[PDB]
């Protein structure tokens, strides 16, 4: 769970991610949902998304600490979550920005790294 956030979709995003259930994580997105990761351009659809997560977020532990949520006037739920994404040898501070549709699918996710020198030695 995350401080300030009780939205089930977001809890599952991080739950499944930390179990290596990458296609389950990716299932949370609408079929044309987009992930915007730190170093590449956008990735479209659960398959490209699940590929990305499995062959990148390998060996990573996402550590969501706190979050905010809003409803925009078009009925979408906006959820911002801050935390860390660590490994054993290095980590990074992270802002996760989610937007959900009325059906609770992820329409898009942006992952922003809050920059440092360890981040500059990324594989990407």
Numbering used by the authors: 15 to 138
Published text:
OCP is a water-soluble, carotenoid-binding, 35 kDa protein found to induce dissipation of phycobilisome excitation energy minimizing energy flux toward the reaction centers. Unlike the wide variety of HCPs, the CTD homologs (CTDH) fall only into two clades, of which only one is present in Anabaena (a clade 2 CTDH). Recently, it was revealed that isolated CTD of Synechocystis OCP and CTDHs from Anabaena and Thermosynechococcus elongatus (a clade 1 CTDH) are also capable of carotenoid binding. Both CTD and CTDH were shown to mediate carotenoid transfer to apo-OCP, apo-NTD, or apo-HCP (from clade 4). Thus one likely role of CTDHs is to serve as intermediate transfer molecules required for delivery of carotenoids from membranes to the HCPs.
In order to obtain a more homogeneous preparation of apo-AnaCTDH dimers, we added 2 M urea to the solution, which caused a large proportion of the high oligomeric states to disassemble, resulting in predominantly dimeric CTDH (solid line). Crystals were obtained in the presence of urea. The asymmetric unit dimer (hence called A-type or back-to-back) was formed via an interaction plane between the β-sheets of two monomers, quite distant from Cys103. PISA suggested that only the F-type dimer has biological significance, (ΔiGP value of 0.067 for the F-type dimer interface). The presence of the disulfide bond forces the formation of the F-type dimer of apo-AnaCTDH. The most striking difference between the apo-AnaCTDH structure presented here and the CTD-OCPO structure is a major shift in the position of the C-terminal tail. In contrast, in the apo-AnaCTDH structure, the C-terminal tail adopts an internal position, coming closer to the F-type interface between the CTDH monomers (CTD-NTD interface in OCP), partially covering the opening of the designated carotenoid-accommodating cavity in the apo-AnaCTDH structure. Owing to the steric constraints, the F-type crystallographic apo-AnaCTDH dimer is not capable of performing carotenoid uptake from the membranes, as the carotenoid channel is partially blocked by the C-terminal tail and filled with the Cys103-containing loop (hereafter β5/β6 loop), while in the A-type dimer, the carotenoid cavity is open. Thus the F-type dimer cannot accommodate the carotenoid unless structural changes occur.
